[PDB]
Amino acid sequence: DKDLLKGLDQEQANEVIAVLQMHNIEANKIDSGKLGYSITVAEPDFTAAVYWIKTYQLPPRPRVEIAQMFPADSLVSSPRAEKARLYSAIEQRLEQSLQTMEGVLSARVHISYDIDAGENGRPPKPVHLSALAVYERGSPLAHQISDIKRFLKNSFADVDYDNISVVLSERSDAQLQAPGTPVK
């Protein structure tokens, strides 16, 4: 009966719990209304629980996206800011698309930025793309990677097969069993 975390939002609470269960630790999610969620554990596990909170940098931080630092609420704007805002949206939109492909469970996308080509009287640089993906276990990753790469190639003004990188894998053995209580 020890207090581990307090004031968690919904996402954070569920993520932390997932980790604890994975490492054989039961956890309680307590709804304190406006005060958020609290996570408590059995005293026998408490030491281990703390160790894992440290190990996995828990609770999770909010996801960082470029547009979050160049808001439309500003009274004025600049070419620099506007171009950045657009690219941010594009990365998000590409992620939304890849996650609908057959066998894909999760995917992340990055695009290179251009902050001062024209500014310096220079022509724009070639666009670089990179992506991460997680597939359903047992899927033929070695071939699937070519769909991603082809799709992305014609998804942007000027890229090529040498400037697109894809790193991927598949999910682990699903934790379908409860950790269990302490012996006492």
């Binding site: 359903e136 276990r137 047992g138 033929p140 071939h143 070519s146 769909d147 790469k149 082809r150 090529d160 097969y161 040498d162 699903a174 379908l176 069993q177």
Partner: protein, 194 residues
């Protein structure tokens, strides 16, 4: 709690098998059904040893043991089809085992498979495996370059590819793999700029 009633409404999606090791097995034909059955075992209950079977997972489990005890054995893939009597494809040309040795081999395989009653080891001709790989590949009008080497063959597909031929290529490869397996014929699709 009869297992047949514990599993989904369409009971014909699973084949329950009674292993000689007192473990009741659930043969599934797809990883979605594999997971389904596993969730049943974890969610519900059944007072008896039980274990879900997956064709690819079992093929792999066996190949691990097999490599350790029979290293250098040249083989293709186990066809489970009818659980009771799975078929073991063995390289006719590369293996020189005697009939007696093959008897022993099948017996070890029977030990590895608690449900199977016997194992049908049969010898396949390496040439026909390669022949089918290339024939279908060129039937699809795909560009490629064959790589014969001792112990196997690789089919290299390079250059920029049309979305249509990409689709066709994968369909072919997946089917070949499903049948023969990737221990002799290796495909190598490489989407590159020209």
């Amino acid at each position: 709690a009869e297992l047949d009633s514990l599993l989904g409404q369409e009971k014909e999606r699973f084949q329950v098998l009674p292993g000689r090791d007192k473990m009741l097995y659930v043969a599934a034909q797809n990883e979605r059904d594999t997971l389904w059955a596993r969730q049943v075992l974890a969610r519900g209950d059944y007072d008896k040893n039980a274990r879900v079977i997956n064709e690819n997972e079992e093929n792999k489990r066996i190949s691990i043991w097999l490599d350790t005890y029979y290293p250098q054995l040249a083989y293709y893939r186990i066809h489970f089809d009818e659980p009771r009597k799975p078929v073991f494809w063995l390289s006719r040309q590369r293996n020189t085992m005697s009939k007696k040795e093959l008897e022993v081999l099948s017996q070890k395989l029977r030990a590895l498979m608690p449900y199977a009653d016997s194992v049908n080891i049969t010898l396949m001709d390496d040439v026909t495996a390669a022949g089918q790989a290339e024939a279908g590949l060129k039937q699809q009008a795909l560009p490629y370059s064959r790589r014969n080497h001792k112990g196997g063959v690789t089919f290299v597909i390079q250059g920029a590819l049309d979305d249509v031929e990409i689709l066709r290529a994968r369909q072919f490869v997946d089917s070949y793999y499903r049948t023969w397996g990737g221990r002799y014929v290796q495909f190598a699709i490489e989407l590159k700029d020209d």
